[PDB]
Design a protein around this ligand. Structure first.
Ligand SMILES: CNC(=O)[C@H]1O[C@@H](n2cnc3c(N)ncnc32)[C@H](O)[C@@H]1O
Lengths: 198, 239
């Protein structure tokens, strides 16, 4: 069901098997480099159940450049691309050893994806920095052009992140908004009284 | 505007639309303190890197990856990983490793860790195509290269933006030298796989295509004997 959907939860404790398979997974995790996830919690996230064939988009910073690569390989992906978002102001000017003009998004592949439009976009994004920890909206169009009409899931998203074709998970979303009947059914089967604790 | 959509419509890469206190005396102190340029032709695969002394404060490593020759001896990451870089690095020293845009971004991190460094910066060379608006694993068009900065032991930004060089040109932007030199990391600077075209004051350049050599280990070491052994490369010369 194409319109936006979301689930306020602790992604650690949600049983994501009820959600199905996705052509694309994107995550902007709270790495431990606020409300944080330890390296072991990040490693233990049940990313593998979410896809059979498709792409993972994994935002990284600092030493998560290395840790995110570990997670990505542990979860069964091969990093095949790395998107760079160059942060500008409203005038298209760029905002320890070096100042940081960019943020990195690792791109991983799992299985044998078929029918994606690889090569439409290039691997650099130039876009206004808005709210803090807020990634740019251009990534959704790049992802839509790469895999049009497929179902997608975002981890650690926030209200502004909800998009058509996307199911958003995060603990700062508002309640539970689900419309795909298969999801609704498996959710009610697994959570008949609508609580998620362990 | 959405420059990603714009790139799919017109072919103009998003970076095409980036618009580019002195800090000059620093450059002058760097130039005063710079050793004369030194260079050696050496086939690095067959060459015992230990002959390169003394141990270096900065190593810039630019192995020629196959992916640099799309439309055209290349080094695999297998070959590079087997270089004994830790044998010539000073216990506190820095590395800058050009990794391309493919598997080098993973394998070059393995190299850094193998040689004893931790990555502290990821410098991106973003290439514009204002004058001209393909790995099978690739999901996106690759328009940049990465230079990893490693540290071992106890002003600028992490982006270089220039126009995409013409086909067959493998030169990296000379701006990487300015970034490295502005860190004031020490004066023993080695460039492995440099070329005649990259020789530069303050650097020892070593690579297989150099047509001339002037390197002498004793002469080179004399540039750093007391009282000049711990200069940053950004201080006044010692009288
Ligand atoms: C950089 N973006 C973020 O950090 C977003 O991730 C959220 N978040 C943090 N921990 C968890 C968690 N265990 N389960 C679900 N969501 C979480 C933040 O509250 C924030 O909304």
């Amino acid at each position: 069901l194409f319109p936006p959907q979301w689930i306020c939860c602790d992604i650690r404790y949600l049983d994501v098997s009820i959600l199905g398979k996705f052509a694309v997974v994107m995550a902007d995790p709270p790495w431990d480099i606020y409300g944080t996830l330890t390296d072991d919690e990040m490693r233990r996230l049940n990313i593998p159940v979410l896809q059979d064939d498709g792409f993972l988009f994994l935002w990284v910073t600092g030493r998560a450049m290395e840790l995110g690569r570990e997670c990505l390989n542990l979860w069964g992906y091969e990093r095949v691309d790395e998107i760079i978002w160059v942060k500008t102001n409203q005038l298209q000017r760029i905002i320890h050893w070096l100042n940081h003009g960019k943020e990195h998004c690792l791109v991983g592949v799992k299985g044998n994806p078929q029918g994606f439009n690889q090569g439409l976009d290039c691997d650099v994004i130039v876009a206004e920095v808005r709210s803090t920890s807020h990634k740019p909206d251009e990534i959704y169009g790049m992802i839509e052009r790469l895999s049009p009409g497929t179902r997608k899931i975002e981890l650690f998203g926030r209200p502004h992140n909800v998009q058509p074709n996307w199911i958003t998970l995060g603990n700062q979303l508002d309640g539970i908004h689900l419309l795909d009947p298969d999801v609704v059914a498996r959710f009610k089967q697994r959570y008949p009284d609508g609580i998620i604790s362990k | 505007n959405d420059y990603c959509q714009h790139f799919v419509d017109t072919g103009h890469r998003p970076q095409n639309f980036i618009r580019d206190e002195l800090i000059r005396l620093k450059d002058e102190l760097i130039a005063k303190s710079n050793t004369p340029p030194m260079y050696l032709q050496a086939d690095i695969e067959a060459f015992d890197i230990r002959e390169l002394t003394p141990k270096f404060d900065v190593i810039l490593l630019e192995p020629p990856l196959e992916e640099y020759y799309r439309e055209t001896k290349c080094w695999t990451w297998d070959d590079i990983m087997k270089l004994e870089i830790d044998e010539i690095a000073a216990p506190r020293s820095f590395i800058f490793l050009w990794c391309g845009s493919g598997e080098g971004l993973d394998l070059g991190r393995v190299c850094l860790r193998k040689w004893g460094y931790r990555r502290c910066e990821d410098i991106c060379w973003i290439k514009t195509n204002k004058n001209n608006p393909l790995d099978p694993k690739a999901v996106f068009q690759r328009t940049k290269e990465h230079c990893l900065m490693g540290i071992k032991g106890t002003v600028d930004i992490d982006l270089i933006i220039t126009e995409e060089p013409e086909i067959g040109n493998i030169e990296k932007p000379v701006e990487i030298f300015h970034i490295i030199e502005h860190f004031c990391l020490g004066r023993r600077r080695l460039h492995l796989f440099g070329r005649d075209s990259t020789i530069r004051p303050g650097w020892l350049t070593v690579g297989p295509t150099l047509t001339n050599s002037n390197y002498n280990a004793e002469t080179y070491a004399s540039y750093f004997s007391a009282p000049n052994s711990y200069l940053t490369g950004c201080t006044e010369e010692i009288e």
